[model samples]
Target: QTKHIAQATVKVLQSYLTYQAVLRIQSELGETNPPQAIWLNQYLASHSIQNGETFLTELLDENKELVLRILAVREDIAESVLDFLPGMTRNSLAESNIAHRRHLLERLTRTVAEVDNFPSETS
Candidate 1:
């Protein structure tokens, strides 16, 4: 899978043209595409293996729309491609040692909700 390749440190190239095209078509229809691309960055800093699966389940269910969009982005929509969220989330933890995946999940949830409680700040 593309995620394994990215984890193996391989570069997987793609195009925004397709995404834009799809979004345009979506706009032509009535669907509201996600306003932006919100990445979890990583999902391991807080879960500690024991809670990882549980946390991930919560995320997949609670953040289903974002999760589904992310899946679509990685799968490239029948374009013969796919990548890894687990890999990206793990790599994100490997990078953001300060606040692991739990916070990232929270941020992702907030990004989807963008509630008034969360500040107009970057995640």
Candidate 2:
């Protein structure tokens, strides 16, 4: 389940996030999950962000804006919402976009539901 979440998140953010950023998040994926680390390292190291902290924050900001954009039009890219979102910085999105905040919650609910049936994309 975690791997599926990680894989789906990687698919959503690989183009926007750096390898190190993913690694930081992936680090929390718990112990004994080495295949993900090995593969993600090989796949994303070449394009790692130089300043991981700043890059991660910037990407997260972009993601927040993207969420707003999508919600403004009532479009859904729900799974991608978790790609770069940090728990600490989540409230602003809710406060500023109160009406659309449900989207985030729904995104969370849907993401978990989808994870069960989501086809594996290992390559």
Candidate 3:
């Protein structure tokens, strides 16, 4: 959704707020909380996709601590840590025009295993 919206040729007016209170007031005017516009802008340029190309140069920052903080609001434990390795590897090859599948897969596998085995150490 963010990807498609990033490509809008007309450059529509979509904005974001750092405060949740602002969203409720804005929602009254038929707008809900939108993703950070600045985040989206930087994300498209050089981070992920830009000029019909997806750059596989960077790793996403979704680590165990980040995920745990988000899940902490409702849970004591997580059944599993979502593996982004496969999708990331595939995208590296197909979308970003990059390589070293085994390298990515292996590293991601090791990271996930370590996190699963030693969450406290990872944190």
Candidate 4:
């Protein structure tokens, strides 16, 4: 079940637009070395396009917020990419409006419930 969710989540973010967003975010974060940046660096180093499910499982467990942020960046970058595409081709793809993007992230967040070992214990 978790694997299935991982695959689904990967599908949502698997786009040229998203890849470009990740690359930009990685460079932007490289200078400061914040916790999020450090984690993303580790993820980048270990993630395999061949086995994205495994990498995304850990990503979901460790940092759902980061995924959400990445998607936000992806949407920001979509303007440029979509502008370059022909009108017919752009119309052929599904519309990715604000609500649609939020819906995708909402589905991803629901996977938190499926996490059997989610670390929510209080001090």
Worst 10 residues of 4 by lDDT: 49-58
Clashing pairs in model 4, backbone N/Cα/C closer than 3 A: none
All candidates in order of lDDT, best leading? 4, 2, 1, 3
Q: List, residue by residue over 10-57, the lDDT tens digit for candidate 2.
A: 554543434433655445333546665464455445534554334445
Preferred candidate (lDDT higher): 3 or 4 = 4
Best by lDDT: 4
C-alpha RMSD (angstroms) for model 3: 21.9
Q: How far is candidate 2 from the true structure (C-alpha RMSD, Å)?
A: 21.2
Write down the lDDT of every candidate, Cα atoms only.
0.46, 0.50, 0.37, 0.66
RMSD in Å for all candidates: 19.3, 21.2, 21.9, 20.9
| TM-score (all chains, Cα) for each model | 0.23, 0.22, 0.17, 0.47
The all-Cα superposition gives candidate 1 an RMSD in Å to the true structure of 19.3
| Tens digit per residue, CA lDDT, model 4, 53-99 | 45445567777876676678877887656666578555655565656
Off by over 4 Å in 1: 1-39, 42-44, 47-56, 77-123
lDDT of 3 by residue, 1-123 (tens): 887876673122111111222223234333332444333334435342232111212212523332233234212211222245458667766854444666798789889877887855353
The alpha-carbon deviation from the true structure for residue 114 of candidate 2, after best TM-score superposition, in angstroms, is 74
After superposition, which runs of candidate 4 have C-alpha atoms over 4 Å from their true positions? 1-14, 49-58, 87-123
Query: How many residue pairs collide in each prediction?
Result: 3, 0, 0, 0
